[PDB]
Amino acid sequence: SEMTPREIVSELDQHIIGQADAKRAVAIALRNRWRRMQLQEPLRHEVTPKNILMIGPTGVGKTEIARRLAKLANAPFIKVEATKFTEVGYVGKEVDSIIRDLTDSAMKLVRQQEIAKNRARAEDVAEERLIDDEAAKLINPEELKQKAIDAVEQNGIVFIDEIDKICKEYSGADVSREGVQRDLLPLVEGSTVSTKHGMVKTDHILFIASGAFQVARPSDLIPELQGRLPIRVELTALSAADFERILTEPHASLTEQYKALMATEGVNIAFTTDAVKKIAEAAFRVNEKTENIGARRLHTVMERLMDKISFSASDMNGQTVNIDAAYVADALGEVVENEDLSRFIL
Amino acid sequence: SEMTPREIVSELDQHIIGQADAKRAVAIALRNRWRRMQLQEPLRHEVTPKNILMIGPTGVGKTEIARRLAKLANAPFIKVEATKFTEVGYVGKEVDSIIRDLTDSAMKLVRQQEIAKNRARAEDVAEERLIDDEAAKLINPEELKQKAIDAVEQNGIVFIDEIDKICKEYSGADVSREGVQRDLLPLVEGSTVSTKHGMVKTDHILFIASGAFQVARPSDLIPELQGRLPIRVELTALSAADFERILTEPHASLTEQYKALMATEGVNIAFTTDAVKKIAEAAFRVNEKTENIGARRLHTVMERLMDKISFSASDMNGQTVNIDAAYVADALGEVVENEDLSRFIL
Amino acid sequence: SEMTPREIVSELDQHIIGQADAKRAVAIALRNRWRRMQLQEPLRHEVTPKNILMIGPTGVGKTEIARRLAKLANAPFIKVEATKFTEVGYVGKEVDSIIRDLTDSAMKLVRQQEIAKNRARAEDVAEERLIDDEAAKLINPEELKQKAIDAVEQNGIVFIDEIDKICKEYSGADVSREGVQRDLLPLVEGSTVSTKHGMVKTDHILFIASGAFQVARPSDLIPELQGRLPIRVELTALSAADFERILTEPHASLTEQYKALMATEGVNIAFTTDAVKKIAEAAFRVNEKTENIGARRLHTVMERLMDKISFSASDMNGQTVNIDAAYVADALGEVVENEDLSRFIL
Amino acid sequence: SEMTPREIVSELDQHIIGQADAKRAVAIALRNRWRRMQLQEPLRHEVTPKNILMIGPTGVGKTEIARRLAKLANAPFIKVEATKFTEVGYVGKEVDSIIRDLTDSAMKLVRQQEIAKNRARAEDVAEERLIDDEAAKLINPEELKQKAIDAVEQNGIVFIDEIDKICKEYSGADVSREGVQRDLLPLVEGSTVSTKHGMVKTDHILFIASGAFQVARPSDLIPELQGRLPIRVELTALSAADFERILTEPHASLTEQYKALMATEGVNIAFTTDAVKKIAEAAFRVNEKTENIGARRLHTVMERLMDKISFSASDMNGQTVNIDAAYVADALGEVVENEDLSRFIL
Amino acid sequence: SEMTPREIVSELDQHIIGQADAKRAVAIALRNRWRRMQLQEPLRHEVTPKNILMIGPTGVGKTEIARRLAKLANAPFIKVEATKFTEVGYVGKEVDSIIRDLTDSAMKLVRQQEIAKNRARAEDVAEERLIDDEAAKLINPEELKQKAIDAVEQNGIVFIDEIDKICKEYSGADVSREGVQRDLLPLVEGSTVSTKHGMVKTDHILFIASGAFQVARPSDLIPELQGRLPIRVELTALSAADFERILTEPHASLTEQYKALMATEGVNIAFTTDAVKKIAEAAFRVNEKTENIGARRLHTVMERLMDKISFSASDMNGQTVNIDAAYVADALGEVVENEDLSRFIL
């Protein structure tokens, strides 16, 4: 879109904490599409998407960045687990499923983005002949699908997750993984796929493949894929401090959410500064003491925390609960420094 | 629904004995949907379902709670065995089957809940032009399916059974299970699925995954799933006393049922207090002496018990059988303290 | 149906010899459906079918009882080999096939039971405008399928054969069987299935699972299945005496059949008492000397017996063959005390 | 087409650097089709396509040549990974997929090449009865598909990639690969395939199979395939000098592209001669120090290079960045002589 | 057809060099169909096709003979690799594919053989109401398909290639091959198959199965197949002399082809007698020095030969190149006595 690299980042800055290199990466990739548009044929179709290979540990924001990037760009998205195409069988759906999925969404993107767009006459004409039975106007599936197929073709964004899980001495008698990248190839290399909405050409689709690559290295990917993964960016682990921010700065952060949800019951809750430090500290503490699952750890802990309130807020209309460091210390309790429990409870 | 956490529990209290933590868990999860509704965009679609991971031994009420929760919430339900997606093949139906199944039910929920709802004119108009051929009015599959797709989207409840049976040194050369949670992922992570009733978006579906986790621990689930299993609740084994209650308090308990069914033959049966103690005692006794299958044990024993009466009630019209501790002791007999039989008969 | 437990048994008594416990079992199960009907909501849908687990050796009448039970109850039946769902592949038809099969039959049951029922006008209206082209009246597939889907739903009877062949140390590295009971589960646990005749709900279907259980024990079935197999009944082996009765009492016994078939050629045959003893004695004798295949053994022996007559009855119009103990002794001959032959000839 | 061997090469010369033998090869193959046309029946259908077996290391231009050849000949193309047909399963799409794919493209080639061709009346008739709803004229799918099926039949070009990966002592217990060439056979040997656009006959299709053949030798292919791979041509590795040219001579070379894309932001960038030498030198340097992935290496390096500018060009409107050898040395930096990084970053 | 055995052979003599026994074999088989026609029912349908088992080394003309036989008999043909039905899977198309394929061709044989046959009015009626839109007349798919299904039924010719590759101590634990001949059986044994053009009955189809049988012997085929392979004929290897003839006598021999193709560029080329000897000598020389691939060897060598001319003929309009033994010696060169190259270049 007309949005500039620095603008895209600010937008992302409002949802993801840290991971600047990554933000910068998706921004360039995205902006590059605005630049291509400006060019003229042949050079226009000539230039291919600047795909990205994010390299980072689970829970640092890899998917989030892509999802958000997609939203801010009003573009058809789609996440997919690379591993999906290896499980003994492959007798379900191949790589084309991705393009189909993505194509469906593109329609569902011009739809809702139309039934409530060019409908500058959902009144004064809907009835008087209520509404509802009005949406079925000006549609024209011949025009609807067109822009949809045009959407995926010009803006689609496929997120290939855990791609490092299909690389590569008894561990060598298995090269099927390489045969996978092979079937994945045509998509990134550009090609045409049949869909119930027409024929979409994956030629200008933006691909974002992430992966821990703790086992393998990007250089182990088949040459064809390395060539089509121009941008290499690495994400970093999150510090307890990062959790502290994520817990409240990102729009719709967890504290904002619980605060809003309880307000619904008529309960005004508040988070003491120290309390947020203790929360994020707990999340981090558990992650290093056991399996570090990144920022996700924040989910189970924040739920364990708001457990009590979350049940009886109904009974507490008109009160103001102040979640201070104590309320936390207690609500959590033994569960953190106790690995036996944490592996279940959190 | 408008029902509050404490109300949902009372409702459940009338069907399930014990397992409070679990009741509390599903109530919060359910209520949270009423709260979300109250919020405003973006925060509305922003908030995701508070999925649950029940951890408990077979026969304690895990499925029941979910089924009941679904009923009390007039919501599309669906149970499914996680193991189902691993059996050598997968050449039948993938994870999308769940969403489709669930979607079908949603229709069948707005249907019966309509053919006998807005039909405030199934008379005075049905005939006089009997009924029956009247139901085919005001329907409008364009509106019928809409709310249906809207139902699964806003209220659907998927119950993933035995999920601990797809986790994870010769026992390590098998990671297919992890590839399963992978394919299960998109559903819980929100996404769109095609169905004969339109396109349902799993984004706001409530997921309840239970599991013994005697083999593995929740922490062994792929990180993405842990993150999406916010609420962790644990159910407890049932004491013989619990059987004693289940045998008569839950609405439509087994004694209520047999009493009603025999009344049909004109036989009024009655259960002596001690007799119910002896029944539940037998159920429990067998469970610890052999394979403890929880409350299910009550089924075969109660059937062994009502065996005799259940056959000749027809012949006994107008009588009143009093099932006392003796009648039980006898009706059961050697079969309990005799493992050779119990493994067959009970 | 309106038939009482004692009546159902008398009916069965006219087709099956012995196996009273089993007869009693299916009768209770069947009658229980008449009782449920009488109840009122909720308790009506609340009560589930009293499924049966027959435990017995091959050839004693397990399937027969179920088939007969089905007939006497004018209910949609269906037998199916549990093993069917394990054979390397499963790339044909899953558990839903059962419900579909069963649903088809239900239609084919309201059909023939209609084309010749409400057709109180297959004359005086069929022609005069022969018949035949008349059956295509009053049908109305919208009403036809309805009762059909209603039939399977309220009366269907699935017979799961050899279920003990999907249970459970090198013999333990195979748990697929358990994954089978898993896929079988939803059916017995009640659920909805799509069919070319509408959507049938397996909730009130009567299930009869039989099995030798010489290898495994019922207690080895997954807990969920034990819980749904309330009634446990055991069938006994058949004595030579039992063969003697089966050979002539059951309606359409083998002697009745051959007698009728030969009458067709104009040959009136008769069975000497001793001859029937010798026949059944042969059947039994072979069964213990080699592989005991129960009452089936009676088929090959009775055919070996009527071999000669069965060919030239045509030539024997107006005669009266008397099959006495001698005729038998001879017709059979060496073939019985000679294992080399019996394993081929009988 | 009317283009002569020497003309085709000049055309290719403008896109591919080096690889003359290969250029010569595709030119002969292509021209041969113009010659065949001139002949008369029978000799016309008698002469078969002069298929090619390119033998060369990854990254030297094998696919490019074929793609370009296809473009210059306005012919339906299609690349496909031979390995694709071996991965455990084959339960997706066989060799016919190739012909179908290729056939689709042929339509999509007469389409765009028509909606904007014989449309010498997309005005003066489109409206006045804007345009758009005009394209749906003179089409006639009966004529559209015809030429399409005629296109693939007379001009189609299938590019079979990595064919040396399906040849052939524990490494001999696997001959499935040979069974692959077997299924691939009919296509090259000429035959008919069903497609949603009619029936295409692969008889006159031009096949280009490439392969490293570092493992196996062409002579190891099944005899039938050797016979149908008339032209054998070998491509050479690329020297750093070759990278230097590729970096700027081929139409739409990478420097041309970045220069154009930045111009979009209002930034006029320039590449110092030495800077291009240093760039190509880096690409080559990394390739020999680690995994040599041919010219592809140029992608990640050129992206690492334009990283900084590519982000803030927006901020730099009206400036003129001069990328000299220094700017490069710096922009790249440690990343090249440092293998730990290169395997990730480049 | 009306053609006699000696006539069929002369026809073949004009395309295949040598292999008389084989020519004789297909002629008898073919003529036998003319004789059957003359007979009267029942003896007419009574007589089955005299199928053939060609036994010979690759490259001697086995397929050619069958293809040619098919052409001269204006009959639906079809080659198919027996191995095709064994490759792990069989989840694509079974033996019926053959009959379907063959049936398609039969239509495509009455089609082109009609659109330009009974069309004695593709003018004087096509326009004047140009042509083209005329072909769609008198067709009548009800008559078109009829003769087509009649074609395959009465004239179809299936060529089963490499059948010796599905026969038969660790090499014995694999009998799947025998199960293949089993599935192949019904076809040769006569039967009916469904097709989009109706139901074709394989009863009178002519089958030609060839095979090296260097591994196994015909006698190893399942008995049923031996019985249906009446005619056993053996083909011989080709001498360098045979190559010399093939190089110029068969209609549309390779020298005829290149001569014609170059004439297109305005270049009149000529082959010195000795030059043809040297060419064929090279083909043979390479075949014995490395892998003997029969006459195919002639393809790569003749292409290596005409390489130079084939490129610049364009530049040589009006010249007359004389390919003498020298031109050859040179054009080939080291490549023949050098195995390292031959295995690539030739």
Ligand SMILES: Nc1ncnc2c1ncn2[C@@H]1O[C@H](COP(=O)(O)OP(=O)(O)O)[C@@H](O)[C@H]1O
């Ligand atoms: N830097 C970050 N800023 C905000 N939220 C984050 C960040 N890193 C992780 N998260 C949160 O943690 C979860 C991480 O999942 P995701 O973004 O897909 O990344 P990854 O795939 O690397 O685990 C999401 O719920 C996201 O909101």
Ligand SMILES: Nc1ncnc2c1ncn2[C@@H]1O[C@H](COP(=O)(O)OP(=O)(O)O)[C@@H](O)[C@H]1O
């Ligand atoms: N706490 C309880 N209260 C009432 N019934 C119970 C309870 N626990 C188990 N049951 C009965 O036992 C069976 C248990 O199955 P279910 O509820 O699915 O739980 P689980 O999956 O843990 O075995 C059901 O028939 C249910 O009625």
Ligand SMILES: Nc1ncnc2c1ncn2[C@@H]1O[C@H](COP(=O)(O)OP(=O)(O)O)[C@@H](O)[C@H]1O
């Ligand atoms: N008790 C019996 N009374 C009458 N017929 C019997 C009896 N037992 C077996 N049979 C006959 O033997 C065969 C037994 O098969 P079936 O009834 O399916 O039982 P099972 O599956 O235990 O072998 C049937 O043909 C049936 O007529």
Ligand SMILES: Nc1ncnc2c1ncn2[C@@H]1O[C@H](COP(=O)(O)OP(=O)(O)O)[C@@H](O)[C@H]1O
């Ligand atoms: N000789 C060359 N001239 C121009 N570009 C080349 C050359 N060799 C390789 N490339 C570039 O490198 C990549 C090589 O891929 P491709 O042409 O498919 O060949 P290969 O399959 O041998 O790797 C393409 O992006 C192409 O532009």
Ligand SMILES: Nc1ncnc2c1ncn2[C@@H]1O[C@H](COP(=O)(O)OP(=O)(O)O)[C@@H](O)[C@H]1O
């Ligand atoms: N006797 C022959 N006469 C003419 N051409 C032959 C002869 N033998 C082989 N060929 C040529 O060599 C190739 C051999 O393939 P084919 O005829 O299928 O036999 P095979 O399957 O035994 O290799 C064909 O291109 C054919 O023209």
